Ligand SMILES: CC(=O)SCCNC(=O)CCNC(=O)[C@H](O)C(C)(C)COP(=O)(O)OP(=O)(O)OC[C@H]1O[C@@H](n2cnc3c(N)ncnc32)[C@H](O)[C@@H]1OP(=O)(O)O
Ligand SMILES: CC(=O)SCCNC(=O)CCNC(=O)[C@H](O)C(C)(C)COP(=O)(O)OP(=O)(O)OC[C@H]1O[C@@H](n2cnc3c(N)ncnc32)[C@H](O)[C@@H]1OP(=O)(O)O
Ligand SMILES: [Cl-]
Ligand SMILES: [Cl-]
Ligand SMILES: [Cl-]
Ligand SMILES: [Cl-]
Ligand SMILES: [Mg+2]
């Protein structure tokens with residue numbers, strides 16, 4: 473149909489965290505305090521020391537106000553052939569190489585306007601290019617909140633069945649089909 | 653010093669496996685039969701179905717003779733703070749997101765001429781670009797042969813201490829310093 477995907481503008485850009493920053497992290501506020509302290513206290517130093525890869529959503533003005541962010545880090549999970557509630561009970565399992573979407577926060581002022589989805593689309597595309605280079609099978613996410621959990625589910629993230637009941641996965645095969 | 657690294661020529665190129673192939677896999681012969689059967693029987697179909705990422709060393713002639721190859725696949729290993737010969741004995745450990753160099757074979761005619769190292773350098777560079785995108789901490793390799801084991805060690809791959817005594821690792825921090 474006359475069906476389009478709309479990404480980041482030049483007014484509000486998504487870019488990987490820079491070497492020299494000049495970002496206004498002091499004004500950012502999403503719902504959760506945890507994701508707020510992380511941004512101002514840990515994000516820049518964890519990115520520098522390559523503990524994670526930080527991508528920022530910012531105003532592209534001289535002040536450079538941060539209005540959202542996300543993090544990516546190589547991960548792995550065991551994929552059982554059937555739901556195995558008791559770990560390693562002769563049920564087949566492969567180790568699935570994935571990328572974990574560790575954090576995802578959007579400023580309250582921007583929430584519910586499609587920016588969370590646009591950042592997810594950005595992450596999916598970063599994972600997709602990397603998959604074709606080194607072999608990554610998807611985007612993993614452990615959703616704390618119920619509001620966060622329904623958000624990932626909506627976008628087509630498969631809720632995984634396991635001992636922990638908050639994990640979701642978006643396969644690379646599915647990302648392939650998004651970008652054709 | 654007047655110290656240089658010399659890579660693939662236009663006569664002998666390293667490239668990711670193509671969609672349409674036209675490679676002469678029938679003439680390839682390294683020392684090991686296993687790595688020979690893999691190339692002609694499994695390589696092309698495992699790459700297509702994205703089970704791994706295959707990179708080929710070929711003659712760049714019309715016949716397109718394959719004279720070496722390698723495979724990359726996202727992996728993970730548990731990194732203990734101290735050598736832990738008995739798994740999970742209250743000794744600290746992080747899960748290390750890595751890329752596994754699954755296979756590496758060079759045709760007998762080309763062996764001992766720097767092509768194994770050049771392919772390793774290629775893989776390190778592919779892993780390096782991917783690290784900066786998604787967060788990968790190094791290149792993992794499980795060396796079967798003693799000749800294969802000494803080869804990886806020579807290039808600066810840290811032999812890992814564990815239950816399995818044939819694994820080696822080349823950190824991303826070290827790759828950073830190679831390409832500056
Ligand atoms: C850190 C983790 O891994 S878990 C993340 C938890 N983080 C938080 O909860 C922090 C506070 N919350 C936030 O930061 C944000 O609200 C997020 C990250 C949860 C979501 O980002 P937002 O931009 O607010 O959501 P977005 O506007 O993209 O989507 C709103 C909803 O409309 C729907 N929607 C989105 N885009 C469209 C569209 N183009 N057309 C129709 N429907 C749409 C989606 O389904 C989405 O989820 P819902 O249907 O369950 O409501
Ligand atoms: C599949 C796995 O993960 S394990 C791989 C096992 N595969 C096999 O054994 C298959 C058969 N063997 C082969 O395919 C090849 O012999 C390989 C893959 C083992 C090595 O590739 P080659 O191109 O033959 O080795 P290369 O010529 O790069 O290096 C030769 C040696 O000279 C040294 N060397 C390499 N380049 C240089 C250089 N520029 N200057 C000085 N010394 C060098 C290296 O240390 C290397 O190892 P060694 O020192 O232990 O001998
Ligand atoms: Cl399987
Ligand atoms: Cl779930
Ligand atoms: Cl730690
Ligand atoms: Cl070892
Ligand atoms: Mg929004």
Ligand SMILES: [Mg+2]
Nearest residue numbers: 764765766767
């Ligand atoms: Mg050689």
